[PDB]
Structure formats: structure tokens, C-alpha cells
């Protein structure tokens, strides 16, 4: 399984609410406050980048991820859509996909989660049907985790991940 | 009247559509394929790069804006959506904005487009019914311009936007 953060903060939530998961469960992890990615411009010269050419081999190898973004403006990080710019359904093709938002409160994180369900079926990746949103309420900065409110929705959510990656 | 191209792809076919309406109304033009701005990372330095001062000021100083982007993997570009993540509602906010979207497909575009009105209404744009979309066949690649057969289309797009605008 492979967990992608999709925040480019080093600060940010999303970051948090990424590691929990990975680390409880055992995953891979891919940090977008750490794998820095230049803004794609469809040159081929981006193709020959490490960074690039590892995103491309850790997501098509991948039996199945769960893509965590934060909400920014009604819709995924633009550090996150760039990323997935680089890929292609030659990655994402038929690929068990999870989705998990963090929002900043109230009613946000629909638009993000649509956001990313409507481009992993653009690539003809498999999203299941639970998805997540996380409100700060959920998140614990100072001890970097996530709160106890909230790990009954995540496990849930893995576990709908991954015994969807079986069958 | 501000026009901003969405594609960071130099050879892009939106960028041909953004310099053909930025020539002809005469209006100002932000290019994402030569206007490279970093990965938005949410640090208070990257407030001091002078291409993110200057992408503020543009935007908030213009009556409105034309938002063009391709569709990618159905989706606005990472690019534009990483730019738009540098803003915020403080200069968008009532902005009079036509959304044209560049799909390469049939029946693209739709979904790109509403990301885009998704997004603009995050930042409490003032976003116009008016919107349009663009194919592979509207774009003259080897003459650098549009097709006639869509001048009229984007033409009333314009005018409707300039409506709003005075409005
Ligand atoms: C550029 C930007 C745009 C944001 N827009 C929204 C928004 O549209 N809706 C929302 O609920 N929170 C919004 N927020 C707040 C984030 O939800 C908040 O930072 C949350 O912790 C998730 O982002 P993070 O992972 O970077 O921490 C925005 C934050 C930033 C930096
Ligand atoms: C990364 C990427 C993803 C794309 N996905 C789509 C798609 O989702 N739907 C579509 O109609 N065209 C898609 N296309 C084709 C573009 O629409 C085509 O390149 C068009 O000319 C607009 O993009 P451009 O401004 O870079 O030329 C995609 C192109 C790229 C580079």
C-alpha cells in the first residue's frame, strides 16, 4: 500500500494524518513537503528526473494508495494535481484508490475529495467508495498525530482500501 | 481586463488561445509556460519572490480576468491550481471571471471547467454563466491562432466578461 501526502507544508495537518496512517499500517509513503517535484511543462527532459521517475515507479507498483490532500480553494493542493500531471493510466489504471481530505472546518473537503475522485477516474483508477474528511478537530499538532475521534473513520477507511485491492 | 494561460506547456494549444485574446482586446496576459513560479509550500518566503508579488498585484488590479486552462486528467492544470494556491479571496473576491477551458478530446472540458467555477467560487469570484471549451480543431498549432470558426465564441465570451466588469 502506498500513502501519498498531498501537502506541500512542512507544517501542514495533512502531513500529520499521512504519516499516522502509514506508520500504523505499514506503508509507503510519499511526502510532498519532502519530494519536491519541479511544476510540470511537458518537456522531456522532466521524464529523465530521479524524483519524477521514482513517482512513476512507487505509484504503478503500488497494489493500492490512499491519497491524502488538503483543501485548498475548494479543491486538491496544486502540489498534489501537478504531481499526478507527471502520471498518467499507464500508473493509475485500474489501481484500488482511497480518498481523504483535510479541511480548514465547517463544511469543507467535498470539493477537494470530488476534486481528486473525478481526476483518478480521468486516469481509470479505482476509488472506493468511502472517502474521508478530516477537520482540524481530528488533528493533534502538538503531538503530531492524529485524535482519538477520529481512527475509528481512518481503519475503516483502509480496511475498505485494502480488501477492495483483493478483490 | 487580465488574461491568464493556464498551460505551462510552451507548445501548449491554450497558450495560442490566451495570446490570441490577450493581442486582440488589447489586455493584460500572465503565461505559466514563461511565468514559472515555484511549488506553493506555504512559507512566508516565497511571499517575498517577486513573481508572487507581482501575480497579486496583477490580479487584483485587473477588472477581470479571463481563466484559460487545459484539461488535465480531467482537471484544471497543476500549474494554474499551484498559482491560484499562492491567492486568495483578498484578490478575487467579486472579480468578474470567463472560464475557457482546452480539452483534447470529443467531449473534454466539462469536467476541467468545473473544477475551475469549483475553485473561483473558493475564492468568492464573481464567475460569469458564459463558459467555453475549446478542441484540437478550434486551435491552428502551425499558424499560432485560432480557428474562425471559433473567434465568434470566444468574442462573446469576452464581451459578456467586459459586461459583468462594468457592471
Ligand atoms: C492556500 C490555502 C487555501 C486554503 N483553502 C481552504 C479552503 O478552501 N477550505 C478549507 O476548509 N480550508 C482551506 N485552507 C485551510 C486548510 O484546510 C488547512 O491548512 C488545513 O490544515 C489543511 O491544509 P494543510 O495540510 O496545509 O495543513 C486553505 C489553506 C491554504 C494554505
Ligand atoms: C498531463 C495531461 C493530461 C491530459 N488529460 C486530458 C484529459 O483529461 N482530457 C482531455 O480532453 N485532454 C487531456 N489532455 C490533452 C490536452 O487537452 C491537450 O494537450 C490540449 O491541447 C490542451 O492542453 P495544452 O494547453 O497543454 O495543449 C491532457 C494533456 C496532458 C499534458
Same mark, same amino acid.
Given at each position: ?16 494524518? #499521512?504519516?499516522?496512517? &502509514?506508520?500504523? /499500517? ?7 513537503? =519532502? ?8 518537456? #522531456? ?8 521517475? =521514482? ?6 507498483? &503500488?497494489? #493500492? ?28 489504471? /485500474?489501481?484500488?484508490? #482511497?480518498?481523504?481530505?483535510? &479541511? ?10 470530488? !476534486? ?7 486516469? /481509470? ?17 502538538? !503531538?503530531?498525530?492524529? &485524535? ?7 481503519? =475503516? ?11
Amino acid at each position: 500500500m502506498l500513502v501519498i501526502n498531498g501537502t506541500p507544508r512542512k507544517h501542514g495537518r495533512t502531513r500529520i494524518a #499521512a504519516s499516522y496512517i &502509514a506508520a500504523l /499500517y505499514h506503508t509507503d509513503l510519499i511526502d510532498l513537503s =519532502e519530494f519536491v517535484l519541479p511544476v510540470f511543462n511537458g518537456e #522531456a527532459e522532466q521524464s529523465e528526473l530521479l524524483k519524477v521517475q =521514482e513517482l512513476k515507479q512507487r505509484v504503478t507498483k &503500488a497494489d #493500492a494508495i490512499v491519497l491524502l490532500s488538503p483543501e485548498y480553494h475548494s479543491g486538491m493542493s496544486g502540489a498534489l494535481k501537478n504531481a499526478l500531471d507527471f502520471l498518467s493510466s499507464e500508473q493509475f489504471k /485500474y489501481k484500488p484508490v #482511497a480518498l481523504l481530505a483535510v &479541511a480548514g472546518g465547517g463544511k469543507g473537503g467535498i470539493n477537494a475529495l470530488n !476534486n481528486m475522485r473525478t481526476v483518478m477516474r480521468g486516469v /481509470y483508477a479505482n476509488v472506493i467508495p468511502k472517502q474521508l474528511v478530516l477537520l482540524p478537530v481530528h488533528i493533534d499538532v502538538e !503531538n503530531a498525530t492524529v &485524535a482519538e475521534n477520529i481512527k475509528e473513520s481512518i481503519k =475503516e477507511l483502509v480496511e475498505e482500501l485494502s480488501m477492495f485491492a483483493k478483490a
